[PDB]
Amino acid sequence: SSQIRQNYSTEVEAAVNRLVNLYLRASYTYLSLGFYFDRDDVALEGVCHFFRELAEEKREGAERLLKMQNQRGGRALFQDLQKPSQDEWGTTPDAMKAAIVLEKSLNQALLDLHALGSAQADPHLCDFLESHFLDEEVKLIKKMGDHLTNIQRLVGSQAGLGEYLFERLTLKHD
Amino acid sequence: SSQIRQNYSTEVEAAVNRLVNLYLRASYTYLSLGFYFDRDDVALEGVCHFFRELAEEKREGAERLLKMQNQRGGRALFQDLQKPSQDEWGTTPDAMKAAIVLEKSLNQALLDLHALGSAQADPHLCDFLESHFLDEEVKLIKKMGDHLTNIQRLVGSQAGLGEYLFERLTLKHD
Amino acid sequence: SSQIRQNYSTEVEAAVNRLVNLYLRASYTYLSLGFYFDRDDVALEGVCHFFRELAEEKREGAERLLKMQNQRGGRALFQDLQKPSQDEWGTTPDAMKAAIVLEKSLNQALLDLHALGSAQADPHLCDFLESHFLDEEVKLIKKMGDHLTNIQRLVGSQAGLGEYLFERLTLKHD
Amino acid sequence: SSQIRQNYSTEVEAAVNRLVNLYLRASYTYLSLGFYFDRDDVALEGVCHFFRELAEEKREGAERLLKMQNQRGGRALFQDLQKPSQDEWGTTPDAMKAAIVLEKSLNQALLDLHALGSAQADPHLCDFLESHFLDEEVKLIKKMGDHLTNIQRLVGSQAGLGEYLFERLTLKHD
């Protein structure tokens, strides 16, 4: 009952543990989206790639949260990781739509943990969220909105041709 | 009432000041077109890029005009910069059409300042316009006509697909 | 009515648009101060340089604000840029005094936007202002106070000699 | 009675020969100003340097005029070079004032030769003056106005100290 702990409330500690689980479930969801687009009957490599790099990024965010929990004298507790909500993910637009509501969920959780940190007067936790997660999420959600707009333009024009072109010309860049 | 000034009429001086304001308003208009295409619901990066590089180029032309005003012993006077005429710019074709009538406006202003310089018998002002602005405008307007022809070909064929392909295949080159 | 927007109030959005205009008018003011010191009858190159680099810096801050507006799902709106308040700027001390009240104005606007962001509980906006504008302004205002003290020392001693020496020995360094 | 000559009037030819003599007399005047500031009882090396580099530049302009005379099928004729109007040149301000009325004289002669070329409809002569002499003169006269303003500021404040400081801090740069 740490020699280290200072200005680290049990309710922030508990919320950090809940955020780790969210980040780990987001990663598990992205693992599933990545491998779905690698299916021979789906076969969109740029999209597979995009979701597999996000799986890593989310796993990395969870580890950063775990490192911090320890730096602060809190104790990590792990819970079950619920399987992704879908087994099959549709087409690229369906997938992108799913990924953006997932990101908005994690962004709200970040925002709520920050409000708790503000309320508990924990400046270090608030700096940590600001410098490592908050801008990362704003930038990723913007990138996903942009991609949603480009796919919708294409698929509106010619669904099959549009999915292939987006994967070749955008996701085989960014 | 310069020790430097020689063969620099007050009406050329006044026109140079008016041209600076035009160039600065053209730059402000291109700033607005660039950021409009960066909107998550517009999302055409090549187009954003194209207009933001023109914003710089126009700002640069104004500064070159200001440097010259001073070299000649004239006095710069600045006026308000009126906001761009549109808040939202439509699609790429609409935007390109707007940018070419803007360029033709500045080209006419250049041509008229040159006619005044010819009439006032100011050879230096005429050389300055010839060597720095007149060919730059002819080349840019040709580039914009070419781009207008390519977009119209595409958007005629398949509006959404056509805008995306132009942005990927042309403006992600020139 | 963005697919992206989250925790971004209309009053922060409106204030960001107002801050862009301030930054753009500050840049236009610095453009005028820079070119005034380039006049053959003023001729202080170090001072011209100092204000022209600030014109760029302010223009850059406006663009960073515009990039953020978009990242957040807000819509940029542009307004007229009012001409600078003076046509002629006096001597270096007069100019420096003008530039520091201008900087204090923008610093107050930053501080007020931050207070609104704090009040709206927008942590990302507050981090953005902290990491990109707030320390930049504190450091620039300190530099301008220091320069004001050095010029006043000099010009107190010998006005013409003092302006020339400051321009040669300080502004032809920092 | 050249096999080469085309659209080159005898009155332009005669004026070019007169301009050579002016350029050569301007060079001879700058030779005298340079060596005057090298006198042990004047001893301002930066000023000596400034005028000796202008002597070279004027000599070079004359040779360029002579090369062109020949390219066009005209015949160079040389006349006496009248000695400089002063034997002793006063102080730096006196010298700079003298050099700027000298430059304005040559600039008027350029402008008048151009008006004759315009009137004779000789486009090549007009391009030649525009691309090689007209901007060179505008830029040099601006530099001399700026230097006049800086010296007057200094010498107003402390004549001897002011001349030494200008020579050390400006002309031992530009």
mmCIF file of N, CA, C and O in Angstrom, chain D residues 98-151:
data_model
loop_
_atom_site.group_PDB
_atom_site.id
_atom_site.type_symbol
_atom_site.label_atom_id
_atom_site.label_comp_id
_atom_site.label_asym_id
_atom_site.label_seq_id
_atom_site.Cartn_x
_atom_site.Cartn_y
_atom_site.Cartn_z
ATOM 1 N N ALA D 98 26.910 63.089 -53.276
ATOM 2 C CA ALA D 98 27.474 63.228 -54.610
ATOM 3 C C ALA D 98 27.238 61.986 -55.470
ATOM 4 O O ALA D 98 26.863 62.145 -56.647
ATOM 5 N N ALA D 99 27.460 60.800 -54.897
ATOM 6 C CA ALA D 99 27.281 59.545 -55.608
ATOM 7 C C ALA D 99 25.826 59.353 -55.991
ATOM 8 O O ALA D 99 25.591 58.937 -57.125
ATOM 9 N N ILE D 100 24.834 59.704 -55.142
ATOM 10 C CA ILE D 100 23.455 59.532 -55.558
ATOM 11 C C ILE D 100 23.057 60.503 -56.649
ATOM 12 O O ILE D 100 22.342 60.053 -57.539
ATOM 13 N N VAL D 101 23.486 61.777 -56.734
ATOM 14 C CA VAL D 101 23.093 62.612 -57.868
ATOM 15 C C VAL D 101 23.776 62.118 -59.132
ATOM 16 O O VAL D 101 23.207 62.294 -60.215
ATOM 17 N N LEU D 102 24.966 61.505 -59.005
ATOM 18 C CA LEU D 102 25.660 60.901 -60.134
ATOM 19 C C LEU D 102 24.832 59.729 -60.659
ATOM 20 O O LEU D 102 24.534 59.667 -61.862
ATOM 21 N N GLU D 103 24.374 58.855 -59.749
ATOM 22 C CA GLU D 103 23.545 57.741 -60.178
ATOM 23 C C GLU D 103 22.229 58.148 -60.809
ATOM 24 O O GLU D 103 21.812 57.562 -61.821
ATOM 25 N N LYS D 104 21.593 59.185 -60.239
ATOM 26 C CA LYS D 104 20.372 59.673 -60.839
ATOM 27 C C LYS D 104 20.660 60.218 -62.229
ATOM 28 O O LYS D 104 19.840 60.067 -63.119
ATOM 29 N N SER D 105 21.822 60.845 -62.464
ATOM 30 C CA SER D 105 22.173 61.321 -63.804
ATOM 31 C C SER D 105 22.254 60.173 -64.775
ATOM 32 O O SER D 105 21.662 60.267 -65.834
ATOM 33 N N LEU D 106 22.980 59.126 -64.407
ATOM 34 C CA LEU D 106 23.084 57.991 -65.320
ATOM 35 C C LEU D 106 21.739 57.343 -65.479
ATOM 36 O O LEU D 106 21.377 56.977 -66.601
ATOM 37 N N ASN D 107 20.916 57.271 -64.412
ATOM 38 C CA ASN D 107 19.609 56.667 -64.568
ATOM 39 C C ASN D 107 18.781 57.465 -65.557
ATOM 40 O O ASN D 107 18.167 56.876 -66.451
ATOM 41 N N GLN D 108 18.788 58.791 -65.519
ATOM 42 C CA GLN D 108 18.056 59.580 -66.513
ATOM 43 C C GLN D 108 18.510 59.329 -67.967
ATOM 44 O O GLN D 108 17.724 59.241 -68.915
ATOM 45 N N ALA D 109 19.830 59.234 -68.146
ATOM 46 C CA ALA D 109 20.407 58.927 -69.448
ATOM 47 C C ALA D 109 19.932 57.561 -69.948
ATOM 48 O O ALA D 109 19.650 57.428 -71.145
ATOM 49 N N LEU D 110 19.872 56.589 -69.058
ATOM 50 C CA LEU D 110 19.313 55.271 -69.432
ATOM 51 C C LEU D 110 17.874 55.377 -69.865
ATOM 52 O O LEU D 110 17.458 54.965 -70.950
ATOM 53 N N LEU D 111 17.099 56.084 -69.046
ATOM 54 C CA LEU D 111 15.704 56.306 -69.326
ATOM 55 C C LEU D 111 15.508 57.054 -70.612
ATOM 56 O O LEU D 111 14.617 56.698 -71.401
ATOM 57 N N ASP D 112 16.289 58.104 -70.865
ATOM 58 C CA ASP D 112 16.203 58.744 -72.146
ATOM 59 C C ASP D 112 16.628 57.871 -73.328
ATOM 60 O O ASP D 112 16.004 57.961 -74.383
ATOM 61 N N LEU D 113 17.663 57.007 -73.227
ATOM 62 C CA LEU D 113 18.035 56.153 -74.336
ATOM 63 C C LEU D 113 16.921 55.166 -74.611
ATOM 64 O O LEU D 113 16.609 54.775 -75.737
ATOM 65 N N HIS D 114 16.247 54.714 -73.554
ATOM 66 C CA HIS D 114 15.146 53.800 -73.710
ATOM 67 C C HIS D 114 13.991 54.472 -74.430
ATOM 68 O O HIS D 114 13.308 53.825 -75.236
ATOM 69 N N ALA D 115 13.662 55.716 -74.091
ATOM 70 C CA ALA D 115 12.623 56.448 -74.778
ATOM 71 C C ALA D 115 12.947 56.599 -76.273
ATOM 72 O O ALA D 115 12.033 56.459 -77.102
ATOM 73 N N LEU D 116 14.210 56.813 -76.646
ATOM 74 C CA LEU D 116 14.621 56.886 -78.030
ATOM 75 C C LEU D 116 14.450 55.528 -78.693
ATOM 76 O O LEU D 116 13.946 55.459 -79.816
ATOM 77 N N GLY D 117 14.850 54.450 -78.022
ATOM 78 C CA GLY D 117 14.685 53.103 -78.530
ATOM 79 C C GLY D 117 13.238 52.740 -78.732
ATOM 80 O O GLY D 117 12.933 52.065 -79.714
ATOM 81 N N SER D 118 12.360 53.110 -77.788
ATOM 82 C CA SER D 118 10.906 52.978 -77.931
ATOM 83 C C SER D 118 10.401 53.735 -79.139
ATOM 84 O O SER D 118 9.736 53.156 -79.990
ATOM 85 N N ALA D 119 10.798 55.006 -79.238
ATOM 86 C CA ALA D 119 10.445 55.848 -80.370
ATOM 87 C C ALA D 119 10.966 55.333 -81.708
ATOM 88 O O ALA D 119 10.241 55.434 -82.690
ATOM 89 N N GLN D 120 12.202 54.827 -81.802
ATOM 90 C CA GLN D 120 12.725 54.242 -83.021
ATOM 91 C C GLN D 120 12.192 52.839 -83.271
ATOM 92 O O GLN D 120 12.547 52.203 -84.287
ATOM 93 N N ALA D 121 11.393 52.303 -82.354
ATOM 94 C CA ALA D 121 10.915 50.913 -82.391
ATOM 95 C C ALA D 121 12.074 49.897 -82.483
ATOM 96 O O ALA D 121 12.221 49.077 -83.427
ATOM 97 N N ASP D 122 12.976 50.015 -81.505
ATOM 98 C CA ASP D 122 14.090 49.094 -81.427
ATOM 99 C C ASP D 122 13.874 48.258 -80.176
ATOM 100 O O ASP D 122 14.362 48.625 -79.118
ATOM 101 N N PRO D 123 13.135 47.141 -80.228
ATOM 102 C CA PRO D 123 12.877 46.258 -79.084
ATOM 103 C C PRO D 123 14.082 45.596 -78.420
ATOM 104 O O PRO D 123 14.135 45.316 -77.223
ATOM 105 N N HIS D 124 15.088 45.279 -79.238
ATOM 106 C CA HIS D 124 16.281 44.678 -78.696
ATOM 107 C C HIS D 124 17.030 45.634 -77.769
ATOM 108 O O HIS D 124 17.517 45.191 -76.729
ATOM 109 N N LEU D 125 17.162 46.908 -78.134
ATOM 110 C CA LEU D 125 17.854 47.917 -77.330
ATOM 111 C C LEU D 125 17.101 48.108 -76.031
ATOM 112 O O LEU D 125 17.712 48.098 -74.971
ATOM 113 N N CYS D 126 15.780 48.208 -76.121
ATOM 114 C CA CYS D 126 14.948 48.321 -74.941
ATOM 115 C C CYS D 126 15.070 47.089 -74.047
ATOM 116 O O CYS D 126 15.198 47.258 -72.835
ATOM 117 N N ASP D 127 15.053 45.852 -74.543
ATOM 118 C CA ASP D 127 15.298 44.699 -73.707
ATOM 119 C C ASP D 127 16.665 44.719 -73.049
ATOM 120 O O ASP D 127 16.827 44.301 -71.902
ATOM 121 N N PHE D 128 17.686 45.095 -73.822
ATOM 122 C CA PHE D 128 19.036 45.173 -73.325
ATOM 123 C C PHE D 128 19.123 46.106 -72.106
ATOM 124 O O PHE D 128 19.677 45.690 -71.071
ATOM 125 N N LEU D 129 18.556 47.332 -72.170
ATOM 126 C CA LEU D 129 18.565 48.293 -71.100
ATOM 127 C C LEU D 129 17.775 47.789 -69.909
ATOM 128 O O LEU D 129 18.180 47.925 -68.751
ATOM 129 N N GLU D 130 16.643 47.130 -70.147
ATOM 130 C CA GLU D 130 15.821 46.566 -69.103
ATOM 131 C C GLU D 130 16.456 45.415 -68.354
ATOM 132 O O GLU D 130 16.462 45.409 -67.102
ATOM 133 N N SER D 131 16.991 44.471 -69.111
ATOM 134 C CA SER D 131 17.578 43.327 -68.469
ATOM 135 C C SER D 131 18.948 43.698 -67.888
ATOM 136 O O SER D 131 19.294 43.199 -66.802
ATOM 137 N N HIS D 132 19.785 44.607 -68.445
ATOM 138 C CA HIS D 132 21.071 44.863 -67.810
ATOM 139 C C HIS D 132 21.254 46.120 -67.010
ATOM 140 O O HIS D 132 22.064 46.056 -66.092
ATOM 141 N N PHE D 133 20.574 47.241 -67.181
ATOM 142 C CA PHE D 133 20.946 48.458 -66.471
ATOM 143 C C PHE D 133 19.857 49.049 -65.601
ATOM 144 O O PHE D 133 20.101 49.493 -64.481
ATOM 145 N N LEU D 134 18.626 49.029 -66.077
ATOM 146 C CA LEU D 134 17.541 49.660 -65.374
ATOM 147 C C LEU D 134 17.283 49.137 -63.981
ATOM 148 O O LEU D 134 17.151 49.995 -63.115
ATOM 149 N N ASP D 135 17.223 47.836 -63.715
ATOM 150 C CA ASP D 135 16.995 47.370 -62.354
ATOM 151 C C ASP D 135 18.233 47.514 -61.474
ATOM 152 O O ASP D 135 18.137 47.824 -60.288
ATOM 153 N N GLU D 136 19.412 47.371 -62.069
ATOM 154 C CA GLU D 136 20.684 47.556 -61.381
ATOM 155 C C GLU D 136 20.732 48.965 -60.761
ATOM 156 O O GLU D 136 21.105 49.101 -59.579
ATOM 157 N N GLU D 137 20.370 49.987 -61.551
ATOM 158 C CA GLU D 137 20.320 51.347 -61.073
ATOM 159 C C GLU D 137 19.258 51.515 -60.018
ATOM 160 O O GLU D 137 19.612 52.080 -58.985
ATOM 161 N N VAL D 138 18.009 51.047 -60.186
ATOM 162 C CA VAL D 138 16.997 51.209 -59.148
ATOM 163 C C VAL D 138 17.466 50.608 -57.813
ATOM 164 O O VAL D 138 17.352 51.265 -56.760
ATOM 165 N N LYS D 139 18.030 49.398 -57.865
ATOM 166 C CA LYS D 139 18.563 48.768 -56.675
ATOM 167 C C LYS D 139 19.742 49.520 -56.083
ATOM 168 O O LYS D 139 19.783 49.682 -54.859
ATOM 169 N N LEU D 140 20.673 50.045 -56.869
ATOM 170 C CA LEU D 140 21.802 50.769 -56.311
ATOM 171 C C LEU D 140 21.366 52.095 -55.691
ATOM 172 O O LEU D 140 21.799 52.427 -54.573
ATOM 173 N N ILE D 141 20.470 52.830 -56.360
ATOM 174 C CA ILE D 141 19.993 54.091 -55.817
ATOM 175 C C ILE D 141 19.256 53.848 -54.505
ATOM 176 O O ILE D 141 19.439 54.624 -53.564
ATOM 177 N N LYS D 142 18.474 52.753 -54.380
ATOM 178 C CA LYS D 142 17.810 52.465 -53.110
ATOM 179 C C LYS D 142 18.826 52.219 -51.994
ATOM 180 O O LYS D 142 18.680 52.738 -50.881
ATOM 181 N N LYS D 143 19.892 51.466 -52.341
ATOM 182 C CA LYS D 143 20.939 51.180 -51.391
ATOM 183 C C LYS D 143 21.613 52.477 -50.943
ATOM 184 O O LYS D 143 21.798 52.649 -49.725
ATOM 185 N N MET D 144 21.938 53.374 -51.885
ATOM 186 C CA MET D 144 22.482 54.682 -51.545
ATOM 187 C C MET D 144 21.516 55.541 -50.746
ATOM 188 O O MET D 144 21.972 56.213 -49.811
ATOM 189 N N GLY D 145 20.199 55.545 -51.010
ATOM 190 C CA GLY D 145 19.280 56.288 -50.151
ATOM 191 C C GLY D 145 19.304 55.745 -48.733
ATOM 192 O O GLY D 145 19.458 56.466 -47.737
ATOM 193 N N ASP D 146 19.245 54.426 -48.606
ATOM 194 C CA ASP D 146 19.284 53.820 -47.295
ATOM 195 C C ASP D 146 20.533 54.234 -46.529
ATOM 196 O O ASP D 146 20.519 54.477 -45.330
ATOM 197 N N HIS D 147 21.705 54.154 -47.170
ATOM 198 C CA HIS D 147 22.993 54.543 -46.586
ATOM 199 C C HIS D 147 22.931 56.018 -46.232
ATOM 200 O O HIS D 147 23.303 56.319 -45.103
ATOM 201 N N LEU D 148 22.417 56.915 -47.089
ATOM 202 C CA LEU D 148 22.266 58.326 -46.746
ATOM 203 C C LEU D 148 21.447 58.510 -45.478
ATOM 204 O O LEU D 148 21.874 59.258 -44.599
ATOM 205 N N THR D 149 20.322 57.813 -45.315
ATOM 206 C CA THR D 149 19.525 57.890 -44.121
ATOM 207 C C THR D 149 20.297 57.434 -42.891
ATOM 208 O O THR D 149 20.335 58.138 -41.878
ATOM 209 N N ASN D 150 20.971 56.290 -42.941
ATOM 210 C CA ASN D 150 21.804 55.843 -41.827
ATOM 211 C C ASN D 150 22.940 56.759 -41.445
ATOM 212 O O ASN D 150 23.040 57.005 -40.237
ATOM 213 N N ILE D 151 23.692 57.303 -42.397
ATOM 214 C CA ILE D 151 24.741 58.247 -42.070
ATOM 215 C C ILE D 151 24.145 59.503 -41.450
ATOM 216 O O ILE D 151 24.610 59.928 -40.390
#
